[PDB]
Amino acid sequence: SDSAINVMKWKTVSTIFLVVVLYLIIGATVFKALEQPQEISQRTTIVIQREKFLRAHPCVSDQELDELIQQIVAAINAGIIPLGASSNQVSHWDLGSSFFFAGTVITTIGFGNISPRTEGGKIFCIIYALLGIPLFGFLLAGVGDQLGTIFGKGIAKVEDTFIKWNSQTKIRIISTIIFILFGCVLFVALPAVIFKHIEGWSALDAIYFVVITLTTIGFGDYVAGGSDIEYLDFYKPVVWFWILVGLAYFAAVLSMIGDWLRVIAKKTKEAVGEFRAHAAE
Amino acid sequence: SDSAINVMKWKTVSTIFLVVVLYLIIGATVFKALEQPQEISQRTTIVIQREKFLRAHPCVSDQELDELIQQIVAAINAGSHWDLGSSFFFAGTVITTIGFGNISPRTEGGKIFCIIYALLGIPLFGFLLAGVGDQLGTIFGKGIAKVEDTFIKWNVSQTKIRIISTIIFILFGCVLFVALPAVIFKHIEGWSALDAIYFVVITLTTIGFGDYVAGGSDIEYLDFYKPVVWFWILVGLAYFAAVLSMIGDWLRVIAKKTKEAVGEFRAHAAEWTANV
Ligand SMILES: CS(=O)(=O)Nc1ccc(C(=O)NCc2ccc(Cl)cc2Cl)cc1
Ligand SMILES: CS(=O)(=O)Nc1ccc(C(=O)NCc2ccc(Cl)cc2Cl)cc1
Ligand SMILES: CCCCCCCCCCCCCCCC
Ligand SMILES: CCCCCCCCCC
Ligand SMILES: CCCCCCCCCC
Ligand SMILES: CCCCCCCCCC
Ligand SMILES: CCCCCCCC
Ligand SMILES: CCCCCCCC
Ligand SMILES: [K+]
Ligand SMILES: [K+]
Ligand SMILES: [K+]
Ligand SMILES: [K+]
Ligand SMILES: [K+]
């Protein structure tokens, strides 16, 4: 029965779909709860700064001020810092920042602090992506395998010495804790400590950047290297290598959580089973 | 030899690594080629707009202008952005990992909630998107059951018709998932021809720069539009996941061919050299 299993699939997909829809509603409501306050409190305190310099210089047209701000905002997206005290500046598409940008594309982090304006760039980026993404996948699978058997040598020693009197399936719980623990050391903690001390970011700002970068949501609200500071150039290529491996590690993490959410479904599936079964005597 | 196979692994990974590294250098050089010009040409034509606004409105001092720019820069860090709908959008950007980032959490809590929202939401979404991939997958399977009987009872027959089935995937696919939505984005947002195709590939590859975001301007939006784009993403993502996988498998073959092509090149060479 080829279509009997497919009916059992749609009943699965539709149920999940509604879980996601609900999860989007939960997230939505929590975010507009978290962010509506700081929005209106910065919105109300920006029209203080507007009407302070609306009435301080009426000799400028006053309708043109909002035009001017839109002219500055539009040029900000090309990467400007327009100032009287500073008119000579770095490039956003230098030898290195374009190489960064290839990175943002093939990883699909896509920070977007750098985005192509040139019609050609867009078209080259389309084609650069569609081939580069699947390409990178192989590197990242390879680095996942390489890291995968690396940690396999770590547990071969640990699953023999901790073989005292009394199990197989229970030491599977202890191996996974040491993954997540030692993992979140080199790939979340240690790089966050370095970003904090190098970029100058907060404690959370650096952890947040790490999860945003290595999940590959990559907002761009934080980008490591993106200010003009100094940069030791021991720094820049370490972060490349961090991403390369960090991505691989998170791909496992997110898969692990994926498989956790398999079980927790099967458990709540069976837990609804027993809840329906007893049903008030 | 447990380490003889592992040396054959690292020789694979390292060779790929250098392909990617080289590919990054190729892309880099092409982008700085494409984009260095438009950078300096917009940089030089923005200090025209600066020094025009001293001369066209001397009312403003040179000193208050740098205050003004700092007032704009400070407001850039804020960006309603977090209404009923735009936060729901933002959950979408997170669990899909498109992450347009036109909306990003400023609140310490938002960041922490977003970390946790992502780590659980991403794997969750994966299942929906796998389900929609399966559903779409057997949908197109019914499309080729009809097409692999009418064209396989006459001319140039099978395993080469595997080439013709995959062209009709990519063709009919790029119709509902690249063309048709790009046509609608062009006419709704007001974007160019390329701008809409570019947004599509950027959104559905999930690079999601954010330089284009469908819904992200303050245009009047029909209550038909917003939830169509959701549904577009939901399916569009699935379709591209296949596409990018297909290209992935293409790059398997081309490697195996150049692997074997180096094999024969070394083989005739090394035996030519050896006779001496
Ligand atoms: C605004 S800027 O572009 O002009 N400044 C720079 C910004 C970032 C980098 C860089 O390479 N950072 C490490 C890195 C590597 C690969 C990937 Cl994929 C992502 C990241 Cl974050 C360099 C210059
Ligand atoms: C600058 S703004 O945020 O305040 N304005 C808006 C921006 C976007 C939307 C919206 O609903 N887009 C549809 C959508 C949904 C989910 C995903 Cl993953 C991608 C997309 Cl394109 C609405 C308002
Ligand atoms: C200061 C750093 C904040 C990070 C706090 C850790 C959050 C990680 C939670 C992992 C997801 C499990 C949520 C459990 C809800 C039942
Ligand atoms: C964050 C909560 C999302 C899932 C709802 C739980 C009920 C399970 C339905 C069987
Ligand atoms: C309108 C520009 C489209 C170009 C990219 C489409 C794929 C063809 C590249 C070989
Ligand atoms: C060792 C694998 C060589 C891979 C070559 C990739 C070809 C891309 C050409 C567009
Ligand atoms: C817009 C033209 C790009 C051509 C790329 C070819 C580089 C080998
Ligand atoms: C972009 C072309 C890469 C060619 C390298 C092939 C080495 C086997
Ligand atoms: K992204
Ligand atoms: K992004
Ligand atoms: K992504
Ligand atoms: K992906
Ligand atoms: K982005």
From Swiss-Prot, chain B:
What keywords are assigned to this protein? Cell membrane, Cell projection, Disulfide bond, Glycoprotein, Ion channel, Ion transport, Membrane, Metal-binding, Phosphoprotein, Postsynaptic cell membrane, Potassium, Potassium channel, Potassium transport, Synapse, Transmembrane, Transmembrane helix, Transport
Highest rank taxon of the organism: Eukaryota
Which portions of the sequence form the region Interaction with AKAP5? Answer: 253-266
Q: What happens when the gene is disrupted?
A: Double KCNK2 and KCNK10 knockout mice suffer from chronic basal allodynia which can be partially reversed by treatment with topiramate, a drug used to treat chronic migrane.
**Residues where K(+) 1 binds:** T97, I98, T206, I207
Assembly and binders: Homodimer; disulfide-linked. Heterodimer with KCNK1; disulfide-linked. Heterodimer with KCNK4. Heterodimer with KCNK10. Heterodimer with KCNK18. Interacts with AKAP5; the channel is recruited to postsynaptic microdomains by AKAP5 where it can integrate neurotransmitter receptor signals. Part of a complex composed of AKAP5 and ADRB2. Upon AKAP5 binding, the channel is no longer sensitive to intracellular acidification, membrane stretch or arachidonic acid stimuli. Interacts with POPDC1; the interaction enhances KCNK2 surface expression and is inhibited by cAMP.
Similarity field: Belongs to the two pore domain potassium channel (TC 1.A.1.8) family.
- Protein name according to UniProt: Potassium channel subfamily K member 2
The range of the complete sequence contained here reads: 50 to 336 of 426
